Design an enzyme around this catalytic site. Sequence first.
Site, short mmCIF file in Angstrom:
data_model
loop_
_atom_site.label_atom_id
_atom_site.label_comp_id
_atom_site.label_asym_id
_atom_site.label_seq_id
_atom_site.Cartn_x
_atom_site.Cartn_y
_atom_site.Cartn_z
CG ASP A 14 2.69 5.73 -7.14
OD1 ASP A 14 2.39 4.78 -7.59
OD2 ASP A 14 2.86 6.15 -5.92
CD1 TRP A 282 3.55 2.99 -0.90
CD2 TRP A 282 1.61 3.22 0.06
NE1 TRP A 282 2.81 3.33 -1.74
CE2 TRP A 282 1.69 3.64 -0.93
CE3 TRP A 282 0.65 3.34 0.93
CZ2 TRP A 282 0.50 4.32 -1.88
CZ3 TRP A 282 -0.72 4.10 0.38
CH2 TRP A 282 -0.39 4.51 -1.02
#
Length: 479
Positions: A14, A282
């Site tokens: 991130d 993910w």
Amino acid sequence: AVYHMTPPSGWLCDPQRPVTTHGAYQLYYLHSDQNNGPGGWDHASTTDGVAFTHHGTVMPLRPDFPVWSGSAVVDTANTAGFGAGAVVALATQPTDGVRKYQEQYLYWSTDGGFTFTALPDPVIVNTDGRAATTPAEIENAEWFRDPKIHWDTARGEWVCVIGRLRYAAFYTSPNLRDWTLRRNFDYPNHALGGIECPDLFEITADDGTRHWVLAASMDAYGIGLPMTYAYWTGTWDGEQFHADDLTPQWLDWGWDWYAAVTWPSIDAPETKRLAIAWMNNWKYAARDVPTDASDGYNGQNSIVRELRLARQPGGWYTLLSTPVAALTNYVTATTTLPDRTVDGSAVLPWNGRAYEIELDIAWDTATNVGISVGRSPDGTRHTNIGKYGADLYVDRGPSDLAGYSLAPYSRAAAPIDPGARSVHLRILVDTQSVEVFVNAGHTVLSQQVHFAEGDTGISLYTDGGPAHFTGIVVREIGQ
């Protein structure tokens, strides 16, 4: 990666809202020494949004105390008291390493965001986390992360958006230290995803109108939607957020454009924003990547894009994307190729791995039309980009690499008028990616692709009839 940010080593994750100091953008991003292991915030700077200089860890990992996503801003008016111009950041950390205790810690810098000091006590506490007993309460307390800060000009105060399970919370504050809980924001379709890495900003549209935008990263794979970044235009009265429409819009239709963050551009802060995202998903983010064994690192960010809000008939507003303008300075060569008509297939007399290709496709009866990128001469490998029915798709399936397959997530697709008989495409190809800007930028598809050294060709294809391929320009990108 030729023109995509990658961590010098380790596992990338991130990105965090960049701050503007020392005549450059200071980007921060989650980093771990092990793929998907405990980590912290690493710092990188860029002056043009394309080339980055890495500076290492800034907000380090600590014994049973990783540092997670949040946001950073520069307190120009010294409202926080840490000094005029100080860079302040809030990041989620699991106190005592307990998930249900994840809360917001403040860090600050007085050197333009190159070194930070931690503020011992969390500036926003996960109180219910201590009171959680039932499996449900515990789940809720275990989703209180990614604070995004924003200076509310009209109200003259700070507002903070925090991600929660299927909803978002808000807090106000006059100094970044004392926060006051506000009304949550709910949306009807929970099969959409539950607010992670929320974004919150104000932007002026092409008609001079000011608007608030609330967004976050989602996972709508279940209902046939993107697992990317969705947003709601609306307003913030200082206590609650009102969306012009409860059904959000999407910023990317590809597979890999997660945890996206946006920030004001220096030359036109209120009208033009920049954005960058983590080119991963993910569903497979944690696995090993080719780059792991060859350069000891995993992950890259997307190209930085420029955002603008455009009015639409009916008085509603939507965002338009486009590759950061500075990218043009990295063009080392420009190749144009004769317009041509193809019925079936044809290989283009050109080869490369890091470039930008633009073209127009026009057809009539053809049911399928497209261009194949990253084509290996044996003809077995290639990523297809084309128009079919009501889809502008990108299929990386034929590019699945042995030992690193992205299957079954192969065919991504963005909506396109089924009645369209021509399309314009701008495709960015790099060694481990393919990004597609369709037409004027209302739809974009970003995807990671594990190309092999030999995947260098380009080919054209049609089904059900001939197509006219025009305005073919290929600009190679270097460094």
